[PDB]
Every structure is written in structure tokens, then in C-alpha cells.
Symmetry: D2
């Protein structure tokens, strides 16, 4: 089966492999040092930014990642948890990994006293949304960005 | 123009809280009064990256607008970004440029803070607000998902 | 102040005017033959395609236009009415002409036994939706078109 | 291995099967139409003087019906030619992801080409990702919002 747990120093390699695949998916290309910057934050206990990794109990191969972080809110005393990134190996999909990755964050946020978790996806991403409508719900909102950003 | 924007002061509480209450009525929600103090506390604390500004009528120092924003991380960049959480202008003070000035103020401060990436989100039914947002920004092709029950 | 009514032969020039302004708004260009084709169909009683016009009761200034037609549906025995076009004079806006034009269709559709009226609009058209949200409700649906069309 | 499904217009003999799918389609949409409407729709499909049609997806092996697509012709003030609207589309649960859905939409495209009315369109529920997974391949999401009269 599959299990999810926070990344360790040893998981850096498999995480970067998924991080690259993830960038390909989005058709983007981040600076190579941003990888090192992010992992540094996941490991720094004083920075509320984490990363969990899905691993197969048999092969023990890292098959999925989920990067998330904590931030404030004017609408409540408790902070919110935002899942920034989610990615499961194209060959390890539909096995329940994405769901177990999101569920892990739910459980972790509950322990942090910040259960209110949210995230966003591109509207045309129906593959991901098949999973999203099962673990959450589409907010009737529109996102606006500053021109050029 | 007779409308200027500026960060809140301890003396701007009464005005900000009134708009905060009216903002709540607009959203059909109701927050505990203790949250109003916590929010204002974070605004005033220079070491907490949560700010608030007010659109002030220059004729009379009457506060007619409110905008609450805060800084937060991102896995897509080394530097953080700004999220405009709340925006509200008095009914009698609408369509005078206050809304756009409040958003520009955040834009300017974002620039000074070295975190120019500013964003926000409105209800898909709020066309009055979007009439402005479409001029000062652009609609991102994204869908927002929330954890069930939240 | 403002009254709505089905177009007549004498409303041709006043209708073609708003037609062209409506075309400018959408940034498109239809041939002049379509102006005559559509208007022909409006006047022809056999064709279930209509057009109403908002007029200033003071004078006889055509300030508004609304084109609509009847079409089938598999979801009911009763046909539906689709409001294809709607344009109010740029100087006569926020007077209630739009609301009146849509209300007129509702009443005419009811007398036809086809009360189900609907229309679509650009997602970015917040000016029109400020009105639509008052006389209608946004369906939680997404429209798709054939590639190229 | 290869499925091999054939798509064709309904005949009086297809009634029983089409209706079975029509009912499942309603269960999916969580609606309930009177049995009379099923008869009316089929009546219109079979009537050549009424521009409403229905095609059905059949297995090449056994002439078992596994898919359905209901569509019709209507006017438009934006062109001389009319256009086509795919009102319904359903494929049996156990016959999905085998190319049936796409073939049905493609059949409508061809018939639209033959009729002189190539402009085909449809709409789906915003939350219907299973379907849009296919629609994005055969069509494109228009930047439009659908509005209906209150109570309807
Ligand atoms: C980052 C942002 O948040 S948005 C971008 C997210 N990332 C991506 O899109 C990257 C590319 N995609 C992926 O990595 C993956 O497809 C993900 C992460 C979107 C999903 O990961 P997966 O490991 O496949 O998730 P999971 O295993 O839970 O998916 C299976 C679920 O989808 C359902 N599903 C899949 N296909 C279908 C279909 N055709 N019809 C109905 N349900 C379907 C499954 O039935 C299942 O639901 P269930 O677990 O109750 O049975
Ligand atoms: C993230 C957020 O919190 S979402 C919710 C924001 N808050 C609300 O919606 C609360 C209720 N509404 C409000 O408080 C206000 O309507 C706001 C803040 C949304 C806008 O504030 P305002 O002070 O009225 O903004 P502003 O004066 O810039 O609005 C006018 C703008 O809308 C344009 N506009 C076009 N048509 C119209 C119309 N029919 N009515 C109003 N404005 C219109 C104006 O032309 C103008 O652009 P411009 O200044 O370049 O000419
Ligand atoms: C299907 C169609 O083809 S989609 C395209 C329709 N056409 C266009 O978009 C063309 C360009 N626009 C126009 O010609 C017009 O603006 C139209 C047709 C969209 C609307 O026509 P109008 O004559 O202005 O409509 P109407 O007079 O009813 O508009 C006033 C309504 O808008 C509301 N409204 C306008 N600005 C605001 C604002 N800032 N805040 C709240 N409500 C507002 C008014 O309150 C009012 O509602 P009410 O009549 O109950 O008081
Ligand atoms: C207007 C309309 O009526 S709206 C409602 C349409 N009807 C419904 O939703 C009823 C319930 N659903 C159904 O009957 C079916 O699931 C339908 C009609 C939506 C689709 O019918 P199908 O016969 O399965 O379609 P089709 O065979 O083309 O589906 C396969 C396609 O989906 C894609 N797909 C399926 N599951 C996935 C997944 N998990 N990830 C990525 N792509 C996927 C396939 O890649 C494929 O594309 P391809 O053929 O180029 O390889």
C-alpha cells in the first residue's frame, strides 16, 4: 500500500524528482536554487512550511508530494493551511495517493489548531478536480491578480 | 481628488471597526468583537506582517474606506506575496475612486516591501466589485477549493 | 417613460442602428444581408423569431433592442425561448430599459406557453450581469463549442 | 481486445434500449421525467420533418446499446445557417473510457456537416469533470456564463 509522512533529509532526492515533473506539468521552470530554498524551509521547524511525501510500502519509492504552509486570516483567530503543490507520479496515479496526501495535511492541520485547509487549481484541470470534489468543495469565488503578476 | 489613503493609527479604530461591521453585514456574516481587536492589534504591531489602510476624506477626516492585507509565503518564489483579504467603501462614498486608491496603496506598499505579487478573490456574484477589479487587475483562470466543512 | 413593443416595418432603420452598435460592442462584423434576413424573420409570423424595441414615450426614439427565438428541448414538452441579443442605447442606460426588455420577453413567452427563458453572456460582462442577477439566476453550467466554431 | 463500437441513428427497434439509457441519464442528473416525455422525444427523433435527432452507440459484437446522444437544430440571429445543440449524452457505466462518448459527439459533427449546419455546441454541469475530460478534446470551453429566468 501507500503511506504519507513528512520529508526528511534523505527524501530530498525523490522530492526534487517530483518537483521537476510538477514544473513540467505546469509548463514552467523555476530557478534550480529554489529547490534548495524550499527544502530548507520544510526542514526548518521555525518556518511553518512543510512537505509530505507519499511512499509505497513495498518498493519504498517516493511516488507523490504535497507542499503546504501556514498563513494568517482577518476572518478568524486561527490561521489557515494552504496546499501550494500536489503531484503524484504519472505511473502511480489513481491508486489513492493524491487522496492520502491531502488527508495527511488535513490530519496535520488538525493537530496544529489550524484545520481550515484550502487550495486552488486551474479551471481546466479536470483530472485533479475529480479528486478535489471528493475531499473538498469548489468555493464560489474568483481569483484576481495584480496586472503582470 | 479629495480622497487619500494611509495606514491605520490607534485613533482610526472607531472608524475602521464601523466599516468592519458594515463589511460583515455585506457578507451576511458575524465575527466576535474580540476578533476586531486582534485584527487591529496585528495591524499596529510592526513585527506582524498584517496591515490595514483607510480611505480618508480630506475635507473632513472622515474614514470612508477600508483595506486589510497581509504577507505570506509561496513555494514558487524566494520572496513572499501580498493577499488583500478585505476591501470596503461606504455606500455614500462609492464610485469616487476610493476603492481603486485603496488597491493602489497596497500595490505601492507591496513594491516598497519587495513583495510586488498582490492578489485577492471576490465572490463570483459580486459584479459591482469586479467592475473595478477588471481595471486594476486580471481574473486568473483558477478555481478555489476548500476543505469540507470549512 | 420607456415602453417596449414588437418591431414593425417602420422600426427597421432604428433597429439596424442598434444592431450595428451591438456589433461594435462585441467587436464583430456581420454582412448587411443578415440585417435584412433577421428583420425579415422577425416580421414573418411563421418564423418563431422575434425582436422588441424599447422606445422613449416622449418622442419615438428607439433606445433598446432585444432579439429572441423559440427552440425545442428534450427535457420538456414545452419549447424554450432564447434571448440571443440585447443592447440598450449607450446614453439611455441605467434607466430601466434593459429590465423592461427582458420583462417583455417573459410576458410574451408566458402567453406562448414557453415560459422557460434563458440567455448567456461573457463572463467578464459585469455591467450586464448587474442586471441579469436581478431578473435571472446564473446556471452552474459551462458552455462548450465545436473546435473552430 | 479493441472495442469497436458503431454509432447510428435510432430506429423504432432501438426504443427499449435508448429509454433504458434515458432513465440512467436521469438518475445521474438526479431528476425524474414523466414516462410521457420519453415517448415524445422518441416520436420527434423518428419524425423526419422535426429537426430533432438521436444516435445510439452499439457494440459491434452484439447489437447491444451502450451509448446515447440526443441533439437538435435551432436558429441563431448571428448567421444565415442554423446550428446544432447536443442536449444529451450518456454512456453506460461499464462501457466508459472505451471511446464511445467521443464517437457519439463525432457522429453529430459529421451529420452537422452534412446538414449544412456545422456549428455544434452543448453545455455541461460545471462540476462534471468526468465529462469535461472529453469535451476539452472535442470542443472548447467558451468564456460564457449561462443565465436562466428565476423559477425555471
Ligand atoms: C497544485 C495544485 O493544487 S493543482 C495541481 C495538482 N497536480 C496535478 O494536476 C499534477 C498532475 N496530476 C497528478 O499528480 C494527479 O492526477 C493528482 C494529484 C491530480 C491526483 O493524484 P492521484 O494519486 O491520481 O489521486 P487519487 O488516487 O486520489 O485519484 C483517484 C480518485 O479519482 C477518481 N477518478 C479518476 N478518474 C475518474 C473518472 N474517469 N471518473 C470518476 N472518478 C474518477 C478515482 O475514482 C478516485 O476517487 P476514489 O479515491 O474515491 O476512488
Ligand atoms: C476582496 C474583496 O474583499 S471582495 C469584496 C469587496 N467589497 C465589497 O464588494 C463591499 C461592497 N462594495 C464596496 O465596498 C465597493 O463597491 C468596492 C470597494 C467593491 C469598490 O469601491 P469604490 O469606492 O466604489 O470603487 P471605485 O470608486 O474605483 O468604483 C468605480 C469604478 O467602477 C467602474 N464602474 C463601471 N460601471 C459601474 C457601475 N455601474 N457602478 C459602479 N462602478 C462602475 C467605474 O467606472 C470606476 O472605474 P474608474 O474609477 O476608473 O472610472
Ligand atoms: C444576452 C446578451 O446579449 S449579453 C450582452 C447584453 N448587452 C450588452 O452588454 C451591451 C452593453 N450594455 C448595455 O447595452 C446595457 O448596459 C445592458 C443591456 C447590459 C443593460 O441595459 P440597461 O438599460 O442599462 O439596464 P437597466 O436599466 O435595467 O440597468 C439598471 C440595473 O443595473 C443595476 N446596477 C447598475 N450599476 C450598479 C451598481 N454600481 N451597483 C448595483 N447595481 C447596479 C441597477 O441597480 C439596476 O437594477 P434595477 O433596474 O432593479 O434598479
Ligand atoms: C451535454 C451533456 O449531456 S453533459 C453530461 C454528459 N453525461 C454524463 O456526464 C453522464 C455520465 N457520464 C457519462 O455517461 C460518460 O462518463 C461521459 C459521456 C461523460 C463520457 O463518455 P465516455 O464513453 O466514457 O467518453 P470517452 O470514451 O471519450 O472517454 C475517454 C476520454 O476521457 C479521458 N479520461 C477518462 N478518465 C480519465 C482520467 N482519470 N484522467 C485523464 N483522462 C481521463 C480519456 O483519456 C479519453 O480521452 P481519449 O478518448 O482521447 O483517450
Amino acid at each position: 500500500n501507500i503511506t504519507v509522512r513528512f520529508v526528511t533529509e534523505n527524501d530530498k532526492e525523490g522530492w526534487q524528482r517530483l518537483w521537476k515533473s510538477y514544473q513540467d506539468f505546469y509548463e514552467v521552470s523555476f530557478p534550480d536554487d529554489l529547490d534548495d530554498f524550499n527544502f530548507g524551509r520544510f526542514l526548518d521547524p521555525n518556518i511553518k512550511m512543510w512537505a509530505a511525501v507519499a511512499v509505497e510500502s513495498s518498493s519504498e519509492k517516493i511516488i507523490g508530494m504535497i507542499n503546504f504552509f501556514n498563513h494568517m486570516t482577518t476572518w478568524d483567530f486561527k490561521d489557515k493551511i494552504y496546499i501550494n503543490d500536489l503531484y503524484v507520479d504519472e505511473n502511480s496515479r489513481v491508486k489513492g495517493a493524491g487522496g492520502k496526501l491531502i488527508q495527511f495535511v488535513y490530519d496535520e492541520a488538525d493537530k496544529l489548531g489550524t484545520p481550515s485547509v484550502y487550495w486552488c487549481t486551474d479551471e481546466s484541470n479536470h483530472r485533479a478536480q475529480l479528486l478535489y470534489v471528493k475531499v473538498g468543495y469548489k468555493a464560489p469565488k474568483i481569483l484576481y491578480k495584480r496586472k503582470g503578476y
